[PDB]
C-alpha cells in the first residue's frame, strides 16, 4: 500500500510501529493488533487476521523476517517486537543519558535543529522507560547551551517562576538567538 | 493519493501546511480544523478526526512524527507545528524587515531568483505575525530593484488604474527584464 | 491523477490551462469551471466544487499557491489566473512580434522544427489578443527563410493565386527543401 | 492507463499513431476515427468523441498540443497530424528510394542496426505515400547486403516454398550472421 | 497492467509468450487465444477480443508492431508469431547443438550457474523441436565437465544403474564440488 | 500488488520463498501448498491453484521461468525449487559448519556486517537440512566474537534469566559495541 513506511532494520522502532499501526487502521485492520478475541472465528475475523500479518511481513527487512516463521499471528509479531525493542532497559537509559549530556551547540548548527535533536533524544529516553518532569527537561536543555546564552537564562531564572515551561524557554532562546546572529 | 505534497522536513512549512489544508478540505475533513467542537460527537466527527490524523501522520517525515506520537487531536498537531515553525516574535519581524529593506538585485543574479528570495522573505515575515498588505509587498519589491527598471516602475505607479496585484507587477518586471536583456 | 501536467510556474499558461481543463473534464468535474450556478447547493454540487480546487492546487507550484488562500473557489482561481496571464496586453504582442521578426533559418535546424517554432509563436501571438489573417501568416513565414528559398517563392507568387494558404506554402517549402539538402 | 505509448515529440510518428489507434480500439472508441458520421448523434457518439479527444490530448506533448487547442474533432486532429508528419511527396519518395538503393552494410555495424535503419527507411517510404509490397521490402533488404550472405540469400530465393515474409527473412539473416561471426 | 513483461524484441520468445499468456489468464482474457469460436459474437466476446489484442500490442517493441496492422485478431497475432519464432527449424537445432558442445566449466563460474545455463540451453533445444531422452541429457552434461569431475562419474557409472537421472547426477556433482573447492 | 518481494534470481532463496508463502497465505491460497489433495476438486481448488501458479510465475525472473513452463502444479514448482536451491547434503553441512566455527570478527568490519554474515551462514546451514536450535545459534554467535565482548557475554550467559533469544543477544552485543566505540 503506502510506501512511506521504511522497512524495519532495528533502528527507530517506535516510528516503524506507529506507521504500521496507522496503515493498519487505514484499512480497518488494526482491530487485530488491539481488540477483543472472539469465542469463534468468523469470516470477518478471517481476512484481517492474515492481512495484518502480510502487511507486517511486507514492511520487514530480510533479517527480521524470522519473527513470523509462518506460525506467529499478527498481534504476536508486534508483541515479540515490543518484548525485545520496546523494553525498559537500564542500558538504553544510560546510553541515552550519556548522549544527552554530550550535546553541545555548534556555530554550524541552527538552534531549531538542535532543539529538534534534543526533543527526539528526550522522546527516546522517555520511551526507554525513564520518567522526566518538566523542570528536568529545561535542566537538560540549558546545560547544552554555550556561554553565549547565559544572561537570558538568568532573566529566565529571576523573573519567570510559574510559566517556566520547556516551550517558554525554547521560545525565549529562539527569540534571543538572532541577537547573537547579528552580533557574531 | 496526492503525491505532490512533499513531506515536512523543517523547510517551507507554509507550503506544506497550505497543501495539507487543501487536501483535508478536499476530503470533507477541514471542518474539524476550523470551526467549533460540537457537544454531540458522533461518527461524522470520529471518522473525520481519524482521517485528518492519518493524513497528517502520513505526510509527516519519520523524524517529525514526534509531534503526534501521543493521543493528540488533529487541531493540536497543527497547533504544535504552528507554535514551532510559525513562531510570533517581534524581534524576528524587525530583523527580517531590516534584511528585506537592505535587499538589492545583483547583476549576476536573474530576476527569478530575486523574486524567489523576496517571496521567501515575505513568507518569513507573515509567519512571524507581521501583517503586510499586498500594496506593501508591491512597494517592498519595487524599492528592491535597480534604476534600470525605474521607468516601468513609474508606469506601474502612475499609469496603472486597475486593482494592482503582486502577480501583475512581477509579470511586468519580467517583461521589462526581458526587454533589457534584449537591448543589452 | 494524471502526472503529465507540469506544475504551473508562470510559463506556457495556455498549455497548463488546457491540460487542467481536460483532466477536470475526465473526472466529470469541469462543470464547476464553466457551468450554471444553482440557486441552492446540493450534494452533487458539493464534491466537484472542492475537487476542482484541490486538483488546481495540486498542479500549482509553490510560488503561485497564494492564488487560492483557502477562500477562492475553483472557478475564481482560473479567473484570476486568466486576468493576469490570459490577457490582451500590448507589451506581450510587441515582444512576440519582435521575436517573430528575428527568426532566421539555420543549417543546423530542420525545416519541420522551424515550422513548428513559427506555428507556436503564431499561436502565442494570436492568444495575445492580436488577429492575424491567412496572408499575414505567409508573409511572416517567408521573411524568415534564407536566400535559398527564393525562386520557389516566385513560383508560389506567380502561379498560385487562390489556393495560397499557409498549409500549401509549408508543403511546397518542405517538398523543395530536399533539393537544397542534396545540393549543399 | 497504458504507459508504453511514448508521448509524440515529432519523432517516430507511425509508431505513436499505431499505438494510439490500438488504444482507441481497446476502449470502443476507434469507431469515430474510421467509418461515417451518423445523422442521429447521441450519447454513444458524444462520449466516444470526448474519450478520443481526451486520450489524444493526454498522449500528446506539451509543445504539440497546438494541434487540438481549438474545438476540433478527434478525426481532424489525426488528419492534421497526418498532413504534417505523413506528408505525401513524390520527390521525397524518389530521394528516399535513392538513399535506400545505395544503402549497404558496413563491417563495424551489426545486423540489428542495419535492420533498424532499413525499417526506418521503409517507414519513411510508406509515410510518403509510396506503395511497397512485402516482397519488394524483402528484395530491398536482400540487395543491401554483402556477398557473405549471398549463399543463404539464394537459399531464401530458391529453396523456400512457403509464403515468404520479412520476419522470416530477418531471422534467417540473423542466424547466418551468427554463423559467420562464429566462423570468423 | 503488470510491468514485469519485457517487450518482445526477437529474443527469448518462449518467456514472452508465457508471460503474455499468464497476464491474459489473470484478467480472464486468455479464452480468446485458446478457446471455442462462437457462432455469433456477443457482448462478452466483444471486449476480451480487443483487450487481448491491446495487451499484445502494449508489450511489443516498435519493430514488431507490424504484426497487427489493425486487422489481425488477437489469436492470429500469436499464431503468426509462433509460425516464425516457435518453429521446428533444423538450423536452430544445429546452432543450439553447437553451443551446447562448446560449454566448458571455468574456475570463475559456479556449478549451480553452469547447471542453470545447461538446463536453459536444453530447454531451448527441446523447444526447437528436437527430442532428448534422460540419458542424452546426462551425456551432454558430463561432456562439459573438466578433468576434476572424473572419478565421481565412474562412481556414477559403476554403482548407479537404475536411479541414473539428471537430478541425481546434478546432486552428486554439487555434493562433490565442495571437495574440489577446499582442495584447490 | 506487494512489490517488496524481489524476483528470484538464484540469490537468497529462503527470503523469496518466505515472502511468497506469506503472500499466498494473504490471499487464501497457501492451503494448496500445505495440506492434502481432496478427492472432490471444485472451483475452490482450481481458482486457488491458478492464483498460486500466476503469483509464482509473476514473482519469478525471466530466466527462472523454466521451472514452470509445463503444466506443473503450484506444489511441484516449489518442490523443484527446494530440490535445487535448498539441497540437503551432509558434506555441505560439515563444510559450512567448519567455515562458521572458524569465523571471527575483524577489527575493520563493523558488527552489523558480521551479524549479516553469520545470518547468511545460519541460513545456508538450515537450507542444507542441518537442525540448529536457537540456543545453538546464540552459542555460535558468541564464540565468534573477540575478547572485548567477553564480559557482556558472561552477563548474557549467567545473569540473564528470561527466555534468551537471538534478537536480544544481538541487541545487547550492538549496545556493547557502541559502548566500546565510545570508550575508544
Author numbering:
A (entry chain E), B (entry chain F), C (entry chain C), D (entry chain D), E (entry chain A), F (entry chain B): 3 to 186
Authors' text:
To enhance the resolution of the capsid region, we used local reconstruction methods to determine the structures of individual subregions of capsid known as capsomers, which are sub-assemblies that are found at the vertices or faces of the icosahedron. Because the Copia capsid adopts T = 9 geometry, there are 2 different hexameric capsomers along the faces (a hexamer with local 3-fold symmetry and a non-symmetric hexamer) and local refinement of each hexamer provided high-resolution maps (overall resolution of the non-symmetric and 3-fold symmetric hexamers are ~3.5-Å and 3.4-Å overall resolution, respectively). The high-quality maps of the locally refined capsomers allowed us to build an atomic model of the Copiagag protein with high confidence and good stereochemistry. The NTDs form central spokes at the center of each capsomer sub-assembly, while the CTD is arranged in the capsomer periphery. In place of the spikes, the Copia capsid contains positively charged pores at the center of each hexameric or pentameric sub-assembly, similar to HIV. Copia forms less interactions within a capsomer than other retroelement-derived capsids for which high-resolution structures are available. Despite the less extensive interfaces between capsid subunits in Copia, we observed an interesting interaction between adjacent CTDs that is not found in other retroelement-derived capsids. We suspect this CTD-CTD interaction plays a key role in stabilizing Copia capsids by locking down the periphery of each capsomer sub-assembly.
